[PDB]
Subunit: 50 residues, 2 copies
């Protein structure tokens, strides 16, 4: 029943696996919502000559 | 895809083999002639 399952599982969110890590499952889906703090970010060489 | 074919072929006329393919299904319309039959010994003693 490999074929019947695979045709039934077409278009389903996929999971893959790493190198040696054999219980580390990568989830091909979802997204992340982030808030980034920028005030402590500075330029270099603003007082360089042209 | 072996399972997928087998689900599709549930309720199919079946075939078998030996060593020739045997068709499991259908009937033979026969006409039987009986006038050439005889009883052995209608003149034995009871």
């Amino acid at each position: 029943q490999e074929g019947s399952l695979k045709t039934a599982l077409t278009g389903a969110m996929r999971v893959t696996k790493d190198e040696n890590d054999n219980n580390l499952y990568k989830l091909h889906g979802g997204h992340v919502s982030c808030r980034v703090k920028l005030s402590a970010l500075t330029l270099k060489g603003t007082s360089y000559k042209m």
